Design a protein around this ligand. Structure first.
Ligand code: LYS
Ligand code: AKG
Ligand code: CL
Ligand code: FE2
Length: 244
């Protein structure tokens, strides 16, 4: 892997950093060469065609919000994509992300959450309100419908995830919600542990595909509280309720 990332100047890193901290999210498409983005879209399609699994559940640890989408789990992506695992460890990608985040990124200590592909396809599909166990995700928007079909990201930064008492609606009541429209081929960088977020349910059948690479910050390397809520890797986790 040779020319993954465009070079960002000092003032570009300042502007991206500022937005990333203020909003919990910033668009980083300009950082990744179009060919690389085209290669990832092709890889995700190949992975989905072989391994897509359906999820339809509500998650107890996020106030029973919905997860309705197909997925490709992390160990399956890792075992079958040298492109994705190479990019995940690529200095030319991690260096500027560390500059934007203002801290060092580490491989996710949980093998089941390095990577995730999701595909929303049905009217009503959604990635319901939630936070991440880890600090960082790079989200590759490989395919997104037009703005009026839905699938927009909503964020509330500067919050946190209390699995025993999530109080997601209180966080909405107490903070403005920011809404983002991403197009096919966009990439964004998200502070997932402190940014409450979701995708707006699709208004009609269509296709929305992202790839998620998740990294740990130093704060993530210490022991975490165990919860049986890791639904993307196993729908039968005890925190998950199947949908009526
Ligand atoms: N915590 C997320 C899952 C992230 C999996 C990929 N890092 C959720 O509840 O939907
Ligand atoms: O679908 C998206 O744009 C973001 C998905 C998300 O929240 C995640 O992958 O953890
Ligand atoms: Cl997340
Ligand atoms: Fe997320």
């Amino acid at each position: 892997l040779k020319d993954v990332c465009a070079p960002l100047e000092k003032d570009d890193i300042r502007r991206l950093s500022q937005a990333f901290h203020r909003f919990g999210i910033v668009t980083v498409t300009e950082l990744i060469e179009p060919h690389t983005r085209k290669l990832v879209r092709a890889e995700a399609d190949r992975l989905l065609d072989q391994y897509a699994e359906r999820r339809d559940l509500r998650l107890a640890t996020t106030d029973y919000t919905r997860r309705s989408m197909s997925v490709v789990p992390s160990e399956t992506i890792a075992a079958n994509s040298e492109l994705v695992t190479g990019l995940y460890a690529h200095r030319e990608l991690l260096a500027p992300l560390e500059a934007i985040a203002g801290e060092r990124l580490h491989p996710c200590p949980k093998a089941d959450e390095e990577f995730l592909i999701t595909r929303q396809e049905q009217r009503g599909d959604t990635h319901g309100w939630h936070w991440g166990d880890f600090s960082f995700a790079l989200i590759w928007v490989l395919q997104a419908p037009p703005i009026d079909v839905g699938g927009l990201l909503q964020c509330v930064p500067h919050t946190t995830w209390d699995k025993a008492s999530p109080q997601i609606n209180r966080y909405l009541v107490e903070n403005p919600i920011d809404t983002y429209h991403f197009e096919s081929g966009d990439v964004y960088f998200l502070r997932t542990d402190t940014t409450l977020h979701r995708t707006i349910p699709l208004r009609e059948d269509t296709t929305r595909i992202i790839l998620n690479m998740t990294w740990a910050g130093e704060r993530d390397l210490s022991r975490k509280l165990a919860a049986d809520d890791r639904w993307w890797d196993n729908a039968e986790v005890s925190a998950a309720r199947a949908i009526k």
